[PDB]
Amino acid sequence: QVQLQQSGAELVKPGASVKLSCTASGFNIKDTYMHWVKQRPEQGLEWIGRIDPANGNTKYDPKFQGKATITADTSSNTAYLQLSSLTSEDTAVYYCASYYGIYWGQGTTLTVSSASTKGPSVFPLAPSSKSTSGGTAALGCLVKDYFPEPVTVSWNSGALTSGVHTFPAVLQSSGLYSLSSVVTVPSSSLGTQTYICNVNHKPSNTKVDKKVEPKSC
Amino acid sequence: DIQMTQSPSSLSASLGERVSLTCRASQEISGYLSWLQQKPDGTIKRLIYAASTLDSGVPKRFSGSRSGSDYSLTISSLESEDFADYYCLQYASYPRTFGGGTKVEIKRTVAAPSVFIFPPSDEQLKSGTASVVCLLNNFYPREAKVQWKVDNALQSGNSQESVTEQDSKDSTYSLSSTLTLSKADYEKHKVYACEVTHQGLSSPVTKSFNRGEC
Numbered sequence: 001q002v003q004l005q006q007s008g009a010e011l012v013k014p015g016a017s018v019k020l021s022c023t024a025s026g027f028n029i030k031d032t033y034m035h036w037v038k039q040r041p042e043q044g045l046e047w048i049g050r051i052d053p054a055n056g057n058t059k060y061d062p063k064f065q066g067k068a069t070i071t072a073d074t075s076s077n078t079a080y081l082q083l084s085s086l087t088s089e090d091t092a093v094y095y096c097a098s099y100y101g102i103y104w105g106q107g108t109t110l111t112v113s114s115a116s117t118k119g120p121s122v123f124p125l126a127p128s129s130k131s132t133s134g135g136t137a138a139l140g141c142l143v144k145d146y147f148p149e150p151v152t153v154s155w156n157s158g159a160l161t162s163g164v165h166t167f168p169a170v171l172q173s174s175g176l177y178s179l180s181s182v183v184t185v186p187s188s189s190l191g192t193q194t195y196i197c198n199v200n201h202k203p204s205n206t207k208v209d210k211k212v213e214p215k216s217c
Numbered sequence: 218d219i220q221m222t223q224s225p226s227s228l229s230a231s232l233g234e235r236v237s238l239t240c241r242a243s244q245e246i247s248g249y250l251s252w253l254q255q256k257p258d259g260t261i262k263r264l265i266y267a268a269s270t271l272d273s274g275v276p277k278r279f280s281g282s283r284s285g286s287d288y289s290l291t292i293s294s295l296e297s298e299d300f301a302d303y304y305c306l307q308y309a310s311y312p313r314t315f316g317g318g319t320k321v322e323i324k325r326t327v328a329a330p331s332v333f334i335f336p337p338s339d340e341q342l343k344s345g346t347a348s349v350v351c352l353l354n355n356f357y358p359r360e361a362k363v364q365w366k367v368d369n370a371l372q373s374g375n376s377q378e379s380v381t382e383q384d385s386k387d388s389t390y391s392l393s394s395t396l397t398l399s400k401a402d403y404e405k406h407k408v409y410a411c412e413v414t415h416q417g418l419s420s421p422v423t424k425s426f427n428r429g430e431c
């Protein structure tokens with residue numbers, strides 16, 4: 001297989017600098033040209049620049065000429081995007097892309113803020129709450145009180161993806177986010193199958209695995 | 218910079234419909250244009266390059282064409298999986314430029330939501346807070362009303378809801394509503410209910426639970 005793995009999401013203070021990475025697996029320098037793209041809601045994709053790992057040559061979108069610096073290391077097969085003098089306008093998702101734009105990284109969410117990071121508390125949303133439903137049952141996890149976004153939620157370490165809905169986070173009056181991830185499953189196998197949600201909030205290095213099962217009463 | 222003007226910004230289309238998106242280059246780009254697709258999860262993939270050449274593995278329903286400075290992407294039979302934002306990319310000169318993007322929305326039949334209600338977990342209760350969650354699963358259209366009722370009394374000021382984007386499989390939406398109360402306030406009442414109103418229902422559907430000792 002082949003893909004581009006980008007560094008984790010993070011929060012950085014205004015005025016500071018940060019360096020994002022994009023490591024390639026499968027291919028390497030041979031393809032040449034590693035591009036960096038910026039994206040914000042209601043704003044399309046914006047090209048920052050690109051680098052030729054073979055000779056270190058770089059080309060930038062004029063607007064980023066004094067804001068972004070792209071570097072590459074063929075040995076470790078990694079490209080870096082250094083952003084300086086961070087401002088609220090730098091809060092976005094950054095994507096790295098290979099030659100011809102065939103391979104794209106999963107993106108890195110950068111939040112510029114003067115606030116502290118906050119790890120979430122993960123609570124189970126047990127199936128068959130009081131009693132069983134008409135054939136199908138729902139279950140999930142409540143990821144509450146975290147900052148900033150985003151949070152990654154998997155089920156059974158990737159083994160469960162069918163019928164999953166991870167809702168957009170809501171901003172609570174405290175300035176902290178909260179979201180839920182739910183799954184609909186057969187009610188008949190609640191006693192035989194195991195469902196565990198895998199939560200990860202990179203900005204605070206919080207990683208939680210919560211087994212969601214029907215509670216006794 | 219070569220400006221890529223993409224239209225329309227948003228497009229709503231029924232399943233099986235033949236749709237097209239267009240990008241007009243402000244400069245001669247000689248066919249050096251790619252079409253990229255970004256799904257709800259942030260995943261970006263290239264569908265076409267050289268204006269009309271389909272990438273390996275790209276479904277035949279996708280096709281690109283050129284007529285002067287007008288570059289179009291056409292989808293023969295719109296499928297639920299096609300729900301995404303499409304961007305044209307100019308790679309003829311520097312700096313590389315993207316079109317504004319076209320948000321493709323999917324029209325489908327009215328579907329009634331399956332409602333579920335969840336009590337606060339015991340471990341959360343230990344922390345002094347209680348979040349009651351109401352789930353409206355797989356419905357269409359997006360419009361829906363959810364009302365919280367504690368002991369039959371309508372609630373206001375203590376809830377937050379969030380709706381997903383259209384599902385990649387069936388084009389439906391799902392809504393989650395959370396009623397957050399303090400442990401003390403939670404323990405003060407018995408019946409917690411969620412009343413849902415949606416076009417796919419002849420009458421409001423109410424789901425509830427009674428906080429009994431376990």
Ligand SMILES: O=C(O)CCCCP(=O)([O-])Oc1ccc([N+](=O)[O-])cc1
Nearest residue numbers: 033035047097098099100101308313
């Ligand atoms: O001869 C030259 O300078 C052009 C050859 C480079 C083709 P390319 O790699 O820039 O194609 C791409 C253009 C843009 C992107 N992008 O992610 O914005 C990705 C690939």
